[PDB]
mmCIF file of all heavy atoms in Angstrom:
data_model
loop_
_atom_site.group_PDB
_atom_site.id
_atom_site.type_symbol
_atom_site.label_atom_id
_atom_site.label_comp_id
_atom_site.label_asym_id
_atom_site.label_seq_id
_atom_site.Cartn_x
_atom_site.Cartn_y
_atom_site.Cartn_z
ATOM 1 N N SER D 38 12.235 -71.009 45.121
ATOM 2 C CA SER D 38 13.313 -71.270 46.060
ATOM 3 C C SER D 38 13.924 -69.959 46.558
ATOM 4 O O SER D 38 14.142 -69.021 45.781
ATOM 5 C CB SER D 38 14.384 -72.106 45.439
ATOM 6 O OG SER D 38 14.877 -73.049 46.380
ATOM 7 N N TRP D 56 19.331 -72.307 42.379
ATOM 8 C CA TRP D 56 18.788 -73.537 41.857
ATOM 9 C C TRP D 56 19.094 -73.711 40.381
ATOM 10 O O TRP D 56 18.194 -73.642 39.533
ATOM 11 C CB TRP D 56 17.282 -73.606 42.122
ATOM 12 C CG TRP D 56 16.722 -75.065 42.141
ATOM 13 C CD1 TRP D 56 17.407 -76.210 41.889
ATOM 14 C CD2 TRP D 56 15.370 -75.487 42.423
ATOM 15 N NE1 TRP D 56 16.594 -77.299 41.981
ATOM 16 C CE2 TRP D 56 15.329 -76.879 42.314
ATOM 17 C CE3 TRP D 56 14.196 -74.821 42.762
ATOM 18 C CZ2 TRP D 56 14.184 -77.604 42.530
ATOM 19 C CZ3 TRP D 56 13.047 -75.561 42.962
ATOM 20 C CH2 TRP D 56 13.048 -76.919 42.844
ATOM 21 N N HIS D 83 23.020 -77.271 52.005
ATOM 22 C CA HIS D 83 22.974 -78.729 51.941
ATOM 23 C C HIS D 83 23.260 -79.162 50.506
ATOM 24 O O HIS D 83 23.613 -78.358 49.649
ATOM 25 C CB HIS D 83 21.663 -79.258 52.616
ATOM 26 C CG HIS D 83 20.399 -79.198 51.802
ATOM 27 N ND1 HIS D 83 19.386 -78.288 52.074
ATOM 28 C CD2 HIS D 83 19.906 -80.035 50.864
ATOM 29 C CE1 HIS D 83 18.353 -78.535 51.278
ATOM 30 N NE2 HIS D 83 18.641 -79.570 50.521
ATOM 31 N N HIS D 85 21.546 -80.920 48.067
ATOM 32 C CA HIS D 85 20.537 -81.001 47.037
ATOM 33 C C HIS D 85 20.756 -79.924 45.997
ATOM 34 O O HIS D 85 21.454 -78.953 46.239
ATOM 35 C CB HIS D 85 19.134 -80.818 47.642
ATOM 36 C CG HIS D 85 18.605 -82.031 48.326
ATOM 37 N ND1 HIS D 85 17.745 -81.974 49.401
ATOM 38 C CD2 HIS D 85 18.804 -83.353 48.083
ATOM 39 C CE1 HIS D 85 17.428 -83.203 49.786
ATOM 40 N NE2 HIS D 85 18.078 -84.054 49.015
ATOM 41 N N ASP D 87 18.829 -77.652 44.671
ATOM 42 C CA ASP D 87 18.435 -76.267 44.935
ATOM 43 C C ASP D 87 19.477 -75.479 45.829
ATOM 44 O O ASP D 87 19.243 -74.308 46.223
ATOM 45 C CB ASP D 87 16.996 -76.154 45.555
ATOM 46 C CG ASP D 87 16.729 -77.144 46.726
ATOM 47 O OD1 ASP D 87 17.367 -78.223 46.795
ATOM 48 O OD2 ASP D 87 15.804 -76.830 47.554
ATOM 49 N N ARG D 88 20.613 -76.010 46.132
ATOM 50 C CA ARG D 88 21.589 -75.356 46.993
ATOM 51 C C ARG D 88 22.988 -75.327 46.371
ATOM 52 O O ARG D 88 23.707 -74.333 46.457
ATOM 53 C CB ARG D 88 21.675 -76.109 48.349
ATOM 54 C CG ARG D 88 20.324 -76.469 48.981
ATOM 55 C CD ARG D 88 19.586 -75.220 49.446
ATOM 56 N NE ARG D 88 18.223 -75.195 48.935
ATOM 57 C CZ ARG D 88 17.484 -74.111 48.884
ATOM 58 N NH1 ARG D 88 17.984 -72.967 49.302
ATOM 59 N NH2 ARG D 88 16.232 -74.166 48.431
ATOM 60 N N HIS D 148 15.883 -82.411 57.203
ATOM 61 C CA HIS D 148 15.483 -82.581 55.802
ATOM 62 C C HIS D 148 16.558 -83.321 55.017
ATOM 63 O O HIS D 148 16.265 -84.021 54.042
ATOM 64 C CB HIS D 148 15.106 -81.211 55.197
ATOM 65 C CG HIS D 148 15.187 -81.146 53.718
ATOM 66 N ND1 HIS D 148 14.154 -81.538 52.898
ATOM 67 C CD2 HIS D 148 16.171 -80.672 52.890
ATOM 68 C CE1 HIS D 148 14.506 -81.367 51.626
ATOM 69 N NE2 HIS D 148 15.722 -80.836 51.596
ATOM 70 N N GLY D 166 16.572 -72.658 55.492
ATOM 71 C CA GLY D 166 16.638 -73.627 54.414
ATOM 72 C C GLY D 166 15.511 -74.639 54.473
ATOM 73 O O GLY D 166 14.543 -74.516 55.235
ATOM 74 N N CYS D 167 15.683 -75.656 53.636
ATOM 75 C CA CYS D 167 14.607 -76.625 53.480
ATOM 76 C C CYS D 167 14.316 -77.452 54.744
ATOM 77 O O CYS D 167 13.427 -78.304 54.716
ATOM 78 C CB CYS D 167 14.966 -77.512 52.329
ATOM 79 S SG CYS D 167 15.488 -76.559 50.961
ATOM 80 N N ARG D 174 2.798 -74.406 53.567
ATOM 81 C CA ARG D 174 3.141 -75.795 53.366
ATOM 82 C C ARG D 174 2.605 -76.598 54.535
ATOM 83 O O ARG D 174 3.098 -76.496 55.673
ATOM 84 C CB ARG D 174 4.658 -75.957 53.203
ATOM 85 C CG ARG D 174 5.170 -75.428 51.850
ATOM 86 C CD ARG D 174 5.650 -76.571 51.022
ATOM 87 N NE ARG D 174 6.986 -77.053 51.343
ATOM 88 C CZ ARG D 174 7.407 -78.286 51.107
ATOM 89 N NH1 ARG D 174 6.573 -79.201 50.588
ATOM 90 N NH2 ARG D 174 8.625 -78.632 51.416
ATOM 91 N N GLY D 208 13.433 -72.377 53.180
ATOM 92 C CA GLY D 208 14.015 -72.665 51.903
ATOM 93 C C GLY D 208 13.127 -72.320 50.747
ATOM 94 O O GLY D 208 13.609 -72.142 49.623
ATOM 95 N N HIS D 209 11.839 -72.172 50.985
ATOM 96 C CA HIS D 209 10.828 -72.158 49.924
ATOM 97 C C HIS D 209 9.625 -71.379 50.426
ATOM 98 O O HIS D 209 9.031 -71.720 51.460
ATOM 99 C CB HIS D 209 10.457 -73.588 49.510
ATOM 100 C CG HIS D 209 11.597 -74.404 49.013
ATOM 101 N ND1 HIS D 209 11.765 -74.706 47.672
ATOM 102 C CD2 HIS D 209 12.616 -75.014 49.662
ATOM 103 C CE1 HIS D 209 12.847 -75.465 47.535
ATOM 104 N NE2 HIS D 209 13.372 -75.672 48.726
HETATM 105 ZN ZN1 LIG I 3 14.457 -77.578 49.061
#
Side-chain angles (χ1 to χ4, degrees):
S38 219
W56 203 356
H83 79 252
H85 282 150
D87 47 333
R88 314 292 129 198
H148 157 84
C167 312
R174 288 249 279 155
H209 301 254

